[PDB]
Design an enzyme around this catalytic site. Sequence first.
Site, PDB file in Angstrom:
ATOM      1  N   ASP A  76      25.790  10.706  10.457  1.00  0.00           N
ATOM      2  CA  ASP A  76      26.761   9.632  10.553  1.00  0.00           C
ATOM      3  C   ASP A  76      26.618   8.698   9.374  1.00  0.00           C
ATOM      4  O   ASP A  76      26.764   7.479   9.516  1.00  0.00           O
ATOM      5  CB  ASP A  76      26.611   8.885  11.899  1.00  0.00           C
ATOM      6  N   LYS A  91      27.883   6.810   6.446  1.00  0.00           N
ATOM      7  CA  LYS A  91      29.163   6.230   6.010  1.00  0.00           C
ATOM      8  C   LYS A  91      28.927   4.742   5.774  1.00  0.00           C
ATOM      9  O   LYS A  91      27.916   4.217   6.230  1.00  0.00           O
ATOM     10  CB  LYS A  91      30.282   6.472   7.033  1.00  0.00           C
ATOM     11  N   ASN A  96      27.549   2.178   8.353  1.00  0.00           N
ATOM     12  CA  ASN A  96      26.178   2.450   8.753  1.00  0.00           C
ATOM     13  C   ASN A  96      25.170   2.261   7.615  1.00  0.00           C
ATOM     14  O   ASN A  96      23.989   2.609   7.780  1.00  0.00           O
ATOM     15  CB  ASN A  96      26.062   3.846   9.358  1.00  0.00           C
ATOM     16  N   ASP A 153      22.012   3.106  12.062  1.00  0.00           N
ATOM     17  CA  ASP A 153      22.768   3.806  13.105  1.00  0.00           C
ATOM     18  C   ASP A 153      22.389   5.288  13.237  1.00  0.00           C
ATOM     19  O   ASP A 153      23.102   6.190  12.750  1.00  0.00           O
ATOM     20  CB  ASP A 153      24.277   3.683  12.867  1.00  0.00           C
ATOM     21  N   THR A 184      32.955  11.387  11.071  1.00  0.00           N
ATOM     22  CA  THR A 184      34.176  10.709  10.641  1.00  0.00           C
ATOM     23  C   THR A 184      34.899  11.639   9.677  1.00  0.00           C
ATOM     24  O   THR A 184      34.283  12.061   8.695  1.00  0.00           O
ATOM     25  CB  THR A 184      33.801   9.378   9.999  1.00  0.00           C
TER      26      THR A 184
HETATM   27  N1  LIG Z   1      19.743  -4.255  11.393  1.00  0.00           N
HETATM   28  C1  LIG Z   1      20.915  -4.842  11.153  1.00  0.00           C
HETATM   29  N2  LIG Z   1      20.947  -5.947  10.402  1.00  0.00           N
HETATM   30  C2  LIG Z   1      22.167  -6.570  10.155  1.00  0.00           C
HETATM   31  N3  LIG Z   1      23.337  -6.002  10.648  1.00  0.00           N
HETATM   32  C3  LIG Z   1      23.251  -4.864  11.376  1.00  0.00           C
HETATM   33  C4  LIG Z   1      22.053  -4.297  11.639  1.00  0.00           C
HETATM   34  N4  LIG Z   1      22.289  -3.200  12.363  1.00  0.00           N
HETATM   35  C5  LIG Z   1      23.598  -3.108  12.558  1.00  0.00           C
HETATM   36  N5  LIG Z   1      24.210  -4.112  11.911  1.00  0.00           N
HETATM   37  C6  LIG Z   1      25.662  -4.428  11.891  1.00  0.00           C
HETATM   38  O1  LIG Z   1      26.205  -3.999  13.143  1.00  0.00           O
HETATM   39  C7  LIG Z   1      27.195  -2.968  12.938  1.00  0.00           C
HETATM   40  C8  LIG Z   1      27.120  -1.921  14.055  1.00  0.00           C
HETATM   41  O2  LIG Z   1      25.768  -1.466  14.225  1.00  0.00           O
HETATM   42  P1  LIG Z   1      25.428   0.093  14.426  1.00  0.00           P
HETATM   43  O3  LIG Z   1      23.966   0.241  14.540  1.00  0.00           O
HETATM   44  O4  LIG Z   1      26.165   0.790  13.331  1.00  0.00           O
HETATM   45  O5  LIG Z   1      26.104   0.377  15.868  1.00  0.00           O
HETATM   46  P2  LIG Z   1      27.364   1.328  16.304  1.00  0.00           P
HETATM   47  N6  LIG Z   1      26.612   2.643  16.903  1.00  0.00           N
HETATM   48  O6  LIG Z   1      28.013   0.710  17.478  1.00  0.00           O
HETATM   49  O7  LIG Z   1      28.209   1.729  15.156  1.00  0.00           O
HETATM   50  C9  LIG Z   1      26.836  -2.385  11.586  1.00  0.00           C
HETATM   51  O8  LIG Z   1      27.998  -1.782  11.001  1.00  0.00           O
HETATM   52  C10 LIG Z   1      26.429  -3.663  10.822  1.00  0.00           C
HETATM   53  O9  LIG Z   1      27.602  -4.433  10.460  1.00  0.00           O
HETATM   54 MG   LIG Z   2      27.560   2.322  13.297  1.00  0.00          MG
END
Ligand SMILES: Nc1ncnc2c1ncn2[C@@H]1O[C@H](COP(=O)(O)OP(N)(=O)O)[C@@H](O)[C@H]1O
Ligand SMILES: [Mg+2]
Length: 271
Positions: A138, A140, A143, A160, A177
């Site tokens: 995944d 992209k 992520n 992610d 995607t």
């Molecule tokens: N560790 C982190 N620090 C800052 N922002 C973070 C983060 N982990 C995730 N994010 C933010 O949260 C969004 C979604 O988190 P993700 O782990 O990708 O969850 P998902 N599976 O719902 O797509 C990311 O695209 C990013 O904008």
């Molecule tokens: Mg994500």
Amino acid sequence: EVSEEGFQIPATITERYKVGRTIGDGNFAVVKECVERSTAREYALKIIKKSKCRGKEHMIQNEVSILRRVKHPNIVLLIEEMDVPTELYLVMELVKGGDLFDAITSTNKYTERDASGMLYNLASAIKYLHSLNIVHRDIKPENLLVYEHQDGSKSLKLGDFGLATIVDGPLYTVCGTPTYVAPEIIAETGYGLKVDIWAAGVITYILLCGFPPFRGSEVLFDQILMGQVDFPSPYWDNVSDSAKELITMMLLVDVDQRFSAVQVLEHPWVN
Ligand SMILES: Nc1ncnc2c1ncn2[C@@H]1O[C@H](COP(=O)(O)OP(N)(=O)O)[C@@H](O)[C@H]1O
Ligand SMILES: [Mg+2]
């Protein structure tokens, strides 16, 4: 303690962390800023809403099984996990610069110096995962998180791990995607670790021009299966032949000819 979304934050989390504002979201998770009370150190709190079954049981998840294994500077670190019946709480390293999807929308395109450094970061993360036989599946921009150094320079961190798994023989689950998906995934002929290189190739292409190499109009999947990478004028005229050659080797339909993460890291454009 109840969040604005209705989450029942466990007592052990609220005891040691001051939960803050939502900094990001996805289809499955809500991510918040939080502060470790004892140190004032900032972390991210990722809240995953589990899939419900008929009855009181919820489906089990794979992400923590993979995250527990991964420790690399270009990968978001997992600090702690708390599983409750309806959701899973993950305390992770906070990356203050946000994600690469928002960075690409704000900046449009990157210089070759900036894009090559970003690919070095991503290919470093992929090399490490592939050494552990882990395919991310995944990769992209949404992520990829942008770490901002004290001097203003930036590095990417891969996050992610929701679709990540171990490769022990060919995989067949159709997932991902459409813009970033490798042809062998859509072809359903068996795939492995190098679907991550194809995703990295697509991202590198977007970094240099602001649009993807396969945009479609069915035409999208045909474009991916044929793998003809064009570098259209005038957008790509000032981009070096070295960058084009590396992107071409990452986007080969033939998985055996396509570069490994090691081959990407050895290419002159990223050195
Ligand atoms: N560790 C982190 N620090 C800052 N922002 C973070 C983060 N982990 C995730 N994010 C933010 O949260 C969004 C979604 O988190 P993700 O782990 O990708 O969850 P998902 N599976 O719902 O797509 C990311 O695209 C990013 O904008
Ligand atoms: Mg994500």
